[PDB]
């Protein structure tokens, strides 16, 4: 979540969602473990690698 920001480098920040260097706007983040996670593991989410 720290890596969704302008000028960041890495796996997801460059292969999934790259923000512009002069990006204007806001980044929203909040905890979702108690709703997005289920017993046995949740496999409904995919990311490019």
């Amino acid at each position: 979540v720290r890596q969704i920001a302008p000028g960041q480098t890495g796996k997801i920040a460059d292969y999934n969602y790259k923000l512009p260097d002069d990006f204007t706007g806001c980044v929203i983040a909040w905890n979702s473990n108690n709703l997005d996670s289920k017993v046995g593991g949740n496999y409904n989410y995919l990311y490019r690698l």
């Binding site: 512009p20 002069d22 990006f23 204007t24 706007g25």
Partner: peptide, 18 residues
């Protein structure tokens, strides 16, 4: 793509292109 600064006043130059 990268758009010219003339067409965008406040926003970022880069626009959705996927």
């Amino acid at each position: 793509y990268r758009r010219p600064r003339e067409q965008i006043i406040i926003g970022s130059l880069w626009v959705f292109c996927g």
